[PDB]
Write an enzyme that holds these catalytic residues in place. Sequence first.
Site, mmCIF file in Angstrom:
data_model
loop_
_atom_site.group_PDB
_atom_site.id
_atom_site.type_symbol
_atom_site.label_atom_id
_atom_site.label_comp_id
_atom_site.label_asym_id
_atom_site.label_seq_id
_atom_site.Cartn_x
_atom_site.Cartn_y
_atom_site.Cartn_z
ATOM 1 N N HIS A 207 0.790 -1.223 0.000
ATOM 2 C CA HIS A 207 0.000 0.000 0.000
ATOM 3 C C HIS A 207 0.826 1.278 0.000
ATOM 4 O O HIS A 207 0.215 2.321 0.154
ATOM 5 C CB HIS A 207 -0.996 0.050 1.188
ATOM 6 C CG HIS A 207 -0.327 0.249 2.507
ATOM 7 N ND1 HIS A 207 -0.178 1.461 3.153
ATOM 8 C CD2 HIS A 207 0.323 -0.622 3.226
ATOM 9 C CE1 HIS A 207 0.480 1.282 4.288
ATOM 10 N NE2 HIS A 207 0.795 -0.001 4.341
HETATM 11 C C1 LIG Z 1 6.994 3.226 5.257
HETATM 12 C C2 LIG Z 1 6.331 3.861 6.473
HETATM 13 O O1 LIG Z 1 6.639 5.014 6.794
HETATM 14 N N1 LIG Z 1 5.452 3.117 7.174
HETATM 15 C C3 LIG Z 1 4.797 3.637 8.386
HETATM 16 C C4 LIG Z 1 3.387 3.164 8.511
HETATM 17 O O2 LIG Z 1 3.375 1.784 8.995
HETATM 18 P P1 LIG Z 1 3.144 0.541 8.019
HETATM 19 O O3 LIG Z 1 3.755 0.685 6.690
HETATM 20 O O4 LIG Z 1 3.546 -0.637 8.815
HETATM 21 O O5 LIG Z 1 1.572 0.446 7.730
HETATM 22 P P2 LIG Z 1 0.723 -0.888 7.821
HETATM 23 O O6 LIG Z 1 1.143 -2.016 6.896
HETATM 24 O O7 LIG Z 1 -0.709 -0.485 7.512
HETATM 25 O O8 LIG Z 1 0.863 -1.256 9.350
HETATM 26 C C5 LIG Z 1 1.426 -2.529 9.740
HETATM 27 C C6 LIG Z 1 0.593 -3.228 10.804
HETATM 28 O O9 LIG Z 1 -0.722 -3.549 10.299
HETATM 29 C C7 LIG Z 1 -0.915 -4.949 10.466
HETATM 30 N N2 LIG Z 1 -1.811 -5.393 9.412
HETATM 31 C C8 LIG Z 1 -1.609 -5.206 8.078
HETATM 32 C C9 LIG Z 1 -2.493 -5.634 7.200
HETATM 33 C C10 LIG Z 1 -3.624 -6.215 7.557
HETATM 34 O O10 LIG Z 1 -4.523 -6.609 6.779
HETATM 35 N N3 LIG Z 1 -3.894 -6.372 8.844
HETATM 36 C C11 LIG Z 1 -3.028 -5.999 9.810
HETATM 37 O O11 LIG Z 1 -3.333 -6.206 11.002
HETATM 38 C C12 LIG Z 1 0.441 -5.608 10.479
HETATM 39 O O12 LIG Z 1 0.501 -6.877 11.154
HETATM 40 C C13 LIG Z 1 1.279 -4.538 11.160
HETATM 41 O O13 LIG Z 1 1.327 -4.622 12.571
HETATM 42 O O14 LIG Z 1 2.810 3.983 9.523
HETATM 43 C C14 LIG Z 1 3.380 3.622 10.813
HETATM 44 C C15 LIG Z 1 2.713 4.481 11.883
HETATM 45 O O15 LIG Z 1 2.504 5.702 11.603
HETATM 46 O O16 LIG Z 1 2.460 3.942 13.015
HETATM 47 C C16 LIG Z 1 4.889 3.828 10.809
HETATM 48 O O17 LIG Z 1 5.497 3.314 11.998
HETATM 49 C C17 LIG Z 1 5.574 3.198 9.637
HETATM 50 N N4 LIG Z 1 6.951 3.643 9.591
HETATM 51 C C18 LIG Z 1 8.048 2.852 9.403
HETATM 52 C C19 LIG Z 1 9.411 3.529 9.300
HETATM 53 O O18 LIG Z 1 8.012 1.632 9.285
HETATM 54 CL CL LIG Z 2 -1.787 -3.236 3.627
#
Ligand SMILES: CC(=O)N[C@H]1[C@@H](OP(=O)(O)OP(=O)(O)OC[C@H]2O[C@@H](n3ccc(=O)[nH]c3=O)[C@H](O)[C@@H]2O)O[C@H](C(=O)O)[C@@H](O)[C@@H]1NC(C)=O
Ligand SMILES: [Cl-]
Lengths: 360, 362
Positions: A207
């Site tokens: 995304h």
């Molecule tokens: C590239 C970027 O800047 N990224 C920033 C971004 O996070 P991110 O890229 O991880 O977005 P994201 O993938 O939606 O979340 C993942 C979670 O969703 C969970 N996740 C994912 C998909 C799903 O269906 N269900 C679910 O539970 C996963 O298991 C997982 O736990 O916003 C974050 C925030 O402001 O706190 C920043 O800390 C990040 N900065 C960094 C540096 O990593």
């Molecule tokens: Cl996603």
Amino acid sequence: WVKILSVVGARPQFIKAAAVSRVLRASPGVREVLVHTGQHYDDNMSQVFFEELEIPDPDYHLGIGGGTHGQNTGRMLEAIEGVLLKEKPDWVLVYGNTDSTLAGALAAVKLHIPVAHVEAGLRSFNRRMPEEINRILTDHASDLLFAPTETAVQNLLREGIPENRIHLVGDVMYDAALHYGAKAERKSRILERLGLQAKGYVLATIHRAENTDDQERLRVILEALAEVHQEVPVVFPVHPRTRKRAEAFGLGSYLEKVVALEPVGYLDMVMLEKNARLIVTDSGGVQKEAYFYRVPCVTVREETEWVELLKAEWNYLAAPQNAKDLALTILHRMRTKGVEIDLYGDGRASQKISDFLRKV
Amino acid sequence: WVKILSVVGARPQFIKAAAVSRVLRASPGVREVLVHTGQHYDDNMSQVFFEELEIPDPDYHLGIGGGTHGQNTGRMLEAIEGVLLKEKPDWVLVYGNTDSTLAGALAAVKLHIPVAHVEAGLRSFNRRMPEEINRILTDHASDLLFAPTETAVQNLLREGIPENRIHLVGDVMYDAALHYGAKAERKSRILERLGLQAKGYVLATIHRAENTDDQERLRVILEALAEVHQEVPVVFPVHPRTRKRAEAFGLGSYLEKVVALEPVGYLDMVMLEKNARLIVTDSGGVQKEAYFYRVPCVTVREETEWVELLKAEWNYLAAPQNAKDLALTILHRMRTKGVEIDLYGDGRASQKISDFLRKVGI
Ligand SMILES: CC(=O)N[C@H]1[C@@H](OP(=O)(O)OP(=O)(O)OC[C@H]2O[C@@H](n3ccc(=O)[nH]c3=O)[C@H](O)[C@@H]2O)O[C@H](C(=O)O)[C@@H](O)[C@@H]1NC(C)=O
Ligand SMILES: [Cl-]
Ligand SMILES: CC(=O)N[C@H]1[C@@H](OP(=O)(O)OP(=O)(O)OC[C@H]2O[C@@H](n3ccc(=O)[nH]c3=O)[C@H](O)[C@@H]2O)O[C@H](C(=O)O)[C@@H](O)[C@@H]1NC(C)=O
Ligand SMILES: O=c1ccn([C@@H]2O[C@H](COP(=O)(O)OP(=O)(O)O)[C@@H](O)[C@H]2O)c(=O)[nH]1
Ligand SMILES: O=c1ccn([C@@H]2O[C@H](COP(=O)(O)OP(=O)(O)O)[C@@H](O)[C@H]2O)c(=O)[nH]1
Ligand SMILES: [Cl-]
């Protein structure tokens, strides 16, 4: 008696805050106030995380969302400030690097309220990226900087921020993984409902705006995942923006050729992550989580903020230039693994943060 | 060929923009768009500067002002993004360090529009100042950093900002003073009107939030100026924030014990500064202007960004802890002079800025 006010807006912040909230809850003489900016509003992007992760209801929901950067940020700034004026917290905690994060910091610092940044000091070194600006401006507005990695610490020192305001505490998302693993185990039937075999599939999330706003990158990725699916099923909880962009550009059929899902809750996600043969992502949280479970990871970007994953050989960059190249890279990487190494701390980043706050 | 949009909001920003705009108008392949945020709105704080300094009317007037940091900044952020999505300029110029500065930079940077900061790198090292936050974040949001002093260059280098985005161009407020000096002399009758001779008064301005939002600090100041006034008349163009605070605190009677005025225009200000025996101020710009005319200065603050002025002995800090002491400091420093030294450049800071904006490249 210390009042710690947490500002969250996005899925990944709800998860970070769930680890930190649990610790602050059970801390003597701490009251936590929790503000939901409304940045993420859909139940599968927000409310499912409040439920499954047992996160107290927000004291405030500002219901601001789905606008431009100027609109969202500008309205969050005014609305958060209104709440800060009412609640007068001792600390404001902001998480990650969205507009919500920056609005929170900026609302607070103008009111002379100390700000702490949970997940501080990450750098892509691509200052054109809205998330890099938010990281830099948040770190520079914050009073305390909770770094998850040594790199992050060095990034902060290089930009003139003094040692004494940086605490290397590890990653609260590792805390959450540890604490919620069991519950994921007993509540999630997603392998079941999907007729999937443990290690019988690849998990994908995509995304980043730079991947979804650009038709040719998005096409390279959806083409690559459909090819990969010919060989090993691809499970793909599709971010809503990603799905919007693919429909808009006429790439919706590639979603039909893999096992595309709506976004899933944290417990399903843990189970899909844990049991994947390999994880393809452009997510920050997902690339660390791949490493949590020792599943090889491919990151569909030109760089990552989490460089130690590349050094440890758990993660591999594959920029989306060519659909066939990307496909082969993913397929080759699924029979690799990285070195034995502990990153992200002991799973007690949240109490290190609790401690440093109620002291400082 | 290139469109450059300036965001301005407050008095000191209209003066800086005057100086730069004049140059950009002479530059070929340069269209300007001026957005006035509405931060300063009274005629003696806004209009008078447009008129006397020969600035074309704003292309846009957002009419935002008089709220909290949150309200002003937030509303300005959304409003400026609107203008930028219409105008789609090649550069956004922001000036100094008000809430309008920050909102301008934040609007632009998230639209991938290059931002240049006129008056970059100044540091008070005091975050409680809203202004210190505004310039840190503005500098970190900017693609070009027009620093007025070496100190400011060093500040930016220390915060991890690369050398190739930093240019030491000097101070466009020296350009302004240099360019408008003859007009002020020709047109201003302020001395005649007040009944002042040269060197026969002290000039005062006070408007910092840290000095006016605190009842007893403000009392210290107003009381100290009343005392000074008994020995050498004090002329005091009063900021509307300062008057409002003085009133609400019940301190208005102190303003009768000096020559209190409404805010004056730039032309009148030059004449008052130029002919003063001493300037006492918590203003940024007024500190430098005191040095332009070789008039000793006392800065009623715990710090200044303009540290070179302290080192050359042209300025002296006197935090307002005690009215008797502050008065005595003021009177003592009336007798002093700094060292001969050139600061702030050659009066062509605007030309250097123009040149960088044109030749920076895509
Ligand atoms: C590239 C970027 O800047 N990224 C920033 C971004 O996070 P991110 O890229 O991880 O977005 P994201 O993938 O939606 O979340 C993942 C979670 O969703 C969970 N996740 C994912 C998909 C799903 O269906 N269900 C679910 O539970 C996963 O298991 C997982 O736990 O916003 C974050 C925030 O402001 O706190 C920043 O800390 C990040 N900065 C960094 C540096 O990593
Ligand atoms: Cl996603
Ligand atoms: C302390 C601080 O942050 N200050 C910042 C602040 O400026 P400042 O403190 O100088 O406000 P200010 O005194 O109202 O204006 C002076 C002018 O008004 C003229 N002036 C003054 C009084 C008057 O009656 N008539 C008149 O013409 C004077 O002749 C003179 O030319 O806003 C500026 C901006 O954002 O661009 C920042 O560059 C400043 N940063 C610095 C670092 O100096
Ligand atoms: O609950 C939500 C949250 C987001 N989105 C979509 O995702 C886009 C990007 O949202 P986000 O707040 O993540 O923006 P970012 O932080 O990536 O700038 C929004 O404009 C919406 O189209 C959505 O459909 N539902
Ligand atoms: O033309 C003006 C501009 C400002 N103000 C008052 O001054 C306050 C401070 O204005 P601002 O927030 O721009 O800060 P400052 O001008 O003191 O830097 C405002 O809230 C208004 O009450 C006013 O009376 N007239
Ligand atoms: Cl003033």
